[PDB]
Structures are given as C-alpha cells and as structure tokens.
Design an enzyme around this catalytic site. Structure first.
Site, PDB file in Angstrom:
ATOM      1  N   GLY A 199       0.838  -1.172  -0.072  1.00 32.28           N
ATOM      2  CA  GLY A 199      -0.055   0.012  -0.134  1.00 32.28           C
ATOM      3  C   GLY A 199       0.775   1.297   0.080  1.00 32.28           C
ATOM      4  O   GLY A 199       1.553   1.486  -0.904  1.00 32.28           O
ATOM      5  N   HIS A 201       2.841   1.453   3.064  1.00 28.90           N
ATOM      6  CA  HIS A 201       3.878   0.964   3.991  1.00 28.90           C
ATOM      7  C   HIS A 201       5.129   0.284   3.243  1.00 28.90           C
ATOM      8  O   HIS A 201       4.822  -0.554   2.655  1.00 28.90           O
ATOM      9  CB  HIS A 201       2.914   0.311   4.815  1.00 28.90           C
ATOM     10  CG  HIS A 201       3.701  -0.428   5.895  1.00 28.90           C
ATOM     11  ND1 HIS A 201       3.729  -1.727   6.045  1.00 28.90           N
ATOM     12  CD2 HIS A 201       4.654   0.190   7.020  1.00 28.90           C
ATOM     13  CE1 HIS A 201       4.460  -2.004   7.329  1.00 28.90           C
ATOM     14  NE2 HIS A 201       4.916  -0.796   7.735  1.00 28.90           N
ATOM     15  N   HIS A 245       5.163  -7.975   8.203  1.00 25.94           N
ATOM     16  CA  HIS A 245       5.092  -8.445   6.715  1.00 25.94           C
ATOM     17  C   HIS A 245       6.039  -9.353   6.631  1.00 25.94           C
ATOM     18  O   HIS A 245       6.897  -9.465   5.870  1.00 25.94           O
ATOM     19  CB  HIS A 245       5.034  -7.393   5.708  1.00 25.94           C
ATOM     20  CG  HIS A 245       4.239  -7.646   4.632  1.00 25.94           C
ATOM     21  ND1 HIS A 245       2.796  -6.899   4.624  1.00 25.94           N
ATOM     22  CD2 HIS A 245       4.385  -8.369   3.693  1.00 25.94           C
ATOM     23  CE1 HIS A 245       2.542  -7.528   3.391  1.00 25.94           C
ATOM     24  NE2 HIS A 245       3.206  -8.397   2.759  1.00 25.94           N
ATOM     25  N   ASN A 251       0.063 -12.968   5.198  1.00 29.80           N
ATOM     26  CA  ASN A 251       0.108 -12.098   6.290  1.00 29.80           C
ATOM     27  C   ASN A 251      -0.977 -11.654   7.218  1.00 29.80           C
ATOM     28  O   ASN A 251      -0.828 -11.808   8.413  1.00 29.80           O
ATOM     29  CB  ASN A 251       0.889 -10.881   5.858  1.00 29.80           C
ATOM     30  CG  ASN A 251       2.263 -11.056   5.421  1.00 29.80           C
ATOM     31  OD1 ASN A 251       3.215 -11.618   6.006  1.00 29.80           O
ATOM     32  ND2 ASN A 251       2.472 -10.988   4.354  1.00 29.80           N
ATOM     33  N   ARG A 253      -3.975 -13.374   6.998  1.00 32.30           N
ATOM     34  CA  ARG A 253      -4.584 -14.490   7.585  1.00 32.30           C
ATOM     35  C   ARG A 253      -3.941 -15.183   8.601  1.00 32.30           C
ATOM     36  O   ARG A 253      -4.503 -15.559   9.577  1.00 32.30           O
ATOM     37  CB  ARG A 253      -4.612 -15.553   6.210  1.00 32.30           C
ATOM     38  CG  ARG A 253      -5.776 -15.214   5.210  1.00 32.30           C
ATOM     39  CD  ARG A 253      -5.744 -16.348   3.973  1.00 32.30           C
ATOM     40  NE  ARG A 253      -4.605 -16.230   3.189  1.00 32.30           N
ATOM     41  CZ  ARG A 253      -4.449 -15.785   2.122  1.00 32.30           C
ATOM     42  NH1 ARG A 253      -5.483 -14.980   1.438  1.00 32.30           N
ATOM     43  NH2 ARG A 253      -3.179 -15.902   1.228  1.00 32.30           N
TER      44      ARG A 253
END
Lengths: 315, 324
Positions: A199, A201, A245, A251, A253
């Site tokens: 995103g 990040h 991450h 990640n 889930r």
C-alpha cells in the site's frame, strides 16, 4: 486555510452537515494541518465524540507538540478516553462470562478469505471441505486458500490452543506453512527474501525480518503482554505481525489466526472480522501506521462484542 | 503335482506341441516359483524359440536357490556373456537413434509436455484426461466433478518439471540431497504441504516390498546421492544409470507419497544431462512396469533396465517419425 475558516463560519451559523464536509476537505488537502485538527476536534466534541476529538488533538501534537489549543484539550481528554476505553473492555468481560457459562467453522474461513479478495461463497467453501471435490468455474488458487485455512486452524486447535508453554517462531511458521502451503508450497513457512511496498507502507527489509520476529515472539511471551487486556494484546499482536510483513503472502490470514490463538488462550471465543468491514479494517491499520494504534484496538474490541452478541443469542 | 506338470511339459516338448508345453511349463512355475529343475528345463525350451534373454533370466533365477545345480551352471556360464553382448548391442542401436534425433522439433517436444504429466499421474491412479490436464495448466481454473487432490497432483508435476528444466538440467556440479527434496517439495506441495520435501517418518508396506525403516532413510539417501556422483555411475551407459537410479529411489521409498513421480523425474534429469530426450512410461505399461520392479526386488534388475531402454527407443522413434 480558506476551507478551515469556511467550516468555522458554518459551525458558528448552524449547518453541522456542511461544516463536517468542509472540515474533512481541509484535512484531505493537508493531513498535517495542526489548526484544522484542533478545530475539527472541538467540533466533534459538540456531537459527544470525545474518542474522535482526542485522536485529533493527539494527531495535532505529533506534528506540533507545544500547540497550546491542542495541549489544553489533549490533557483533559487523555485520562477520560483511557477510562471510556477501560469501561468498554469491562462490558466485553461481562459478556465473555455470560458466553462461557452457556457451522461457525465455515463462517470464519469465509470471512478471512473474502476480506482478502476471495470470490468463493459459504456454500462453495462447505462443498470444498466436506467433499474435497472442486467447485466448478472457480480458480484452484481460491479453492486451495480455503483448504489451507482449514488445515491451519485444525492444527492450531489440535496442537497450539491447549498447549502449555511459550509461543515459538516455529509455531508462526507452522501456521503459515498450512495457510499458504496448498497455494504456494515453495514460499509457505519461510520468511520473505525481497523488499516490497504494501500500500503506502514499507515493511522491514528481509535481512531484518528474522530479528524483528525474534523480538515479536519475545514480546508475546513477556510479562508486559500478559498484564494487558486480552483484547488489546490480541489486537497489538495482529497489528505488529502485519507491520513486520514476514511472508510474501498470507500475512493478514496468519495475523488473524495468531490473534484468535491469543483470544482462545484467554478464554475468549474465536473472532471474525467480516468481509463488509474490509474498508474499516484497512482504515484503522493505516491510522496505526500513521502513529495511533488505539482506533485499531477499538475496531478489534467491537469485533469481539459482535461475536459475543451473536453467541449470546442462545439461553 | 509340480514335478508331474514338469514331466508332462517335457513329454510335449519331445513330441512337438510347443503351445501345450509352454502352458504346462508356466503351470509348474505358478505352483512352485522356486523350482530349480523347471526353471532350467523352461530356460532350454525358451532357447529353442531364440529367446536367450528369457533363458539366462531363468538359469540365473535357478542358481539364486541352488548355486551348484550342474544343468543350470553349465548353461548360465554360456548365456552370461551372451546376454551382456545382446544388451550392449541394443544400447548402441539407441545411441545411433539419439544421434539421428540430434541432427518443429521444439514445438513437437512441448506438444508432448502435457502428455508426460498425464502418464506419470495416470500410472499412479489419477483419473484426469489429457484435455482436463490442459485446462488445469492453461487456465488455472478447476475441472468440474473431479477431486482437488487429483488436480493439485497435476499442478505440482508442472511445477516440479518447470523447476528441473530451469535450475537443474543445465546446472554444473554434483546432484545433492536438497535437489531431490526440492523436486518432491513441488511434486507433493499442492497436495500435502506438510509432508512435501521431508522424509517418511513411518514404516509401511509397498505391495509385497518392505522399504528401509524411517531411521535408515537419511543414511540410505546419503549413500544413493554419493552413488549418483561416483565414477562407477558415470562409466555406465546413460540408459542403465537412469534406470538404476529410478529403481533405487523406488526401493528406498523415502517419502510417504510421490515416490514414483520423483523417481521418474530424476530418471529424465539423468537422461537429459546425458543428451537424451525426456522419456515417458505410458499408462498402458502400468502392469509391465510393476512386473519388472517386482523382478528387480526378487533379485534381477536387468528386465527393468531393458524396460527403460525400450521406453527410450519408443520415445526416440516418435521423435524420429514426427520430424519426417
């Protein structure tokens, strides 16, 4: 500055609906606007929204820590929000008591995969796990995501929930090996080796992931983590795994399975973040990346109350 | 009754009736498969139809019970160097066909790529068709009314052989234990990610064969990969080496599943590294393929080496005809 002064003219006259839109526009154009954050905070207190007001004064002080109008309000709202937050947890504690004194396996597999983009229905998921035969016209990847989820949560329930002792790094990898195993057996159960963007990040570089994860599992077993309320601890764990991450995929889930493992070990039922809350769920994670984890902790807490309210529908 | 059936077979062989003799010879062996006298007499009988390969097999089988049986010893010492030559001559026929196939060839090879995935999974009991396998691999969408396990076996095969071709075939250096595990991690991964790429931890029965106990599997696999890199294995003909490797991995049975699939991928990895094309053991040869493995477990690997050799000639004949 013109949109802020326009929002103040509407708030002074009366029009509440037009003021909030003008306030939101000034923050969309400049999200680090110290004066619009404080004025939108005092405005939100007029609708009895103290949680939002405190968020806005805290966001203001992260930019300008000595801003008098933010400091004078922050100092008043800070202990008040802390109480409001504690009171909602005690409401959740009484509902867990009522539940503990007193079909859903497929409902959780459905929401944990649907919130990630999976188009399979609840009746299709039921066909996959009951029969082990394929659903027509759907991708094998989507159907393998469902099989891996079933394997991961059957392993957690059979080996991790009731087990005595500390949570290890091997337990996190074992869960991921089952979550991503049927979709990507090459990368399942092993850390990410490349740097990526998620995103807006940038997670830790692959050379720092192992240490970041040794530090995370050390925190999970620490006394500080136990002293926290289970709902706060479960939510912080979820967030920190999503921040690190550690895998190329699965990640969210795995972080949602670790979260319920923490809740179930605390005597809470497994929690579901529904498909419909996808946008709300990503909004609170963005706010936690920006600097404040409290909206996320409150989102997880509401998710626990809704789950308990559904379970309290029986005598 | 076994000795009576043998003497009855001798009576027809002496008179003439060879069709009734072979049936009477086969009945005495079905009654007692370790009958030394019927093996020699059936061996001498088979030499009369010019079947020296079968005769040597029978005398060799007779001397694995009674090593000092005069009638077996006198004939086996005679047929032993004879079959060795006949076997060498069939390999040189194969070597000339490999040359001829090295003189559309790329499009024809990838046309029979789904063909290899179909036979390696069909010979293990998979009910998917070639058109269904093509749908799975081209679209990545499920085939209706078939199990997800069967469809994941196909995906894993495609992954395993795409990995072999991309990182192992043209690779320089020795074959490692990690290379076997990496292939297996892709063969079984989409079906069983928990057991994929790790050795078998339980003891099992495989037909009428008891493979090594799970505590001996690592040591037997270290010894197998040491043999794969040894000078003795390099000196062998590629078709013999590829076939012996296939057999030894099937004998060890290092994984709970996917042993046949991985042993056939290592078989072709050895052949492709020797300049040979990838070989296919067709679904129709399932029974013949298990008959030669049973004979290798019983004591003689030669029928298996000959089965692999005829599989390479058929593959080369298809490549020599398709480009004609």
């Amino acid at each position: 500055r013109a949109a802020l002064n326009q929002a103040l003219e509407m708030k002074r006259q009366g029009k509440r609906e037009k003021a909030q839109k003008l306030f939101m526009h000034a923050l969309k154009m400049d999200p680090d606007f110290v004066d619009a954050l404080t004025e939108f905070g005092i405005f939100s207190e007029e609708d009895k929204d103290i949680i939002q007001a405190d968020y806005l004064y805290t966001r203001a002080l992260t930019i300008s820590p000595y801003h008098e109008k933010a400091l004078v309000n922050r100092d008043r709202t800070l202990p008040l929000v802390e109480e409001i937050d504690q009171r909602y947890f005690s409401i959740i504690d009484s509902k867990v008591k009522k539940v503990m004194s007193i079909e859903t396996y497929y409902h959780h597999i459905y929401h944990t995969v649907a919130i990630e983009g999976n188009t399979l229905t609840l009746s299709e998921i039921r066909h996959i796990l009951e029969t082990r035969y394929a659903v027509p016209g759907k991708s094998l990847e989507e159907q393998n995501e469902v099989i891996g989820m079933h394997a991961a949560m059957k392993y957690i329930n059979t080996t991790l929930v009731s087990r005595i002792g500390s949570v290890t790094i091997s337990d996190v990898l074992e869960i991921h090996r089952r979550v991503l195993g049927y979709v990507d057996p090459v990368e399942a159960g092993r850390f990410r080796t490349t740097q990526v963007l998620v995103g807006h990040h940038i997670p830790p570089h692959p050379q720092d992931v192992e240490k970041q994860m040794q530090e995370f599992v050390q925190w999970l077993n620490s006394e500080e983590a136990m002293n926290l309320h289970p709902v706060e601890f479960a939510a912080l764990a979820h967030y920190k795994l999503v921040y690190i991450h550690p895998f190329i995929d699965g990640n969210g889930r795995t972080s949602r399975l670790l979260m319920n493992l923490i809740l179930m070990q605390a005597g809470y039922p497994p929690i579901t973040i529904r498909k419909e809350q996808r946008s709300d769920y990503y909004h609170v994670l963005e706010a936690a990346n920006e600097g404040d984890v409290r909206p996320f902790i409150r989102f997880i807490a509401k998710c626990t109350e809704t789950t308990l309210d559904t379970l309290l529908f029986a005598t």
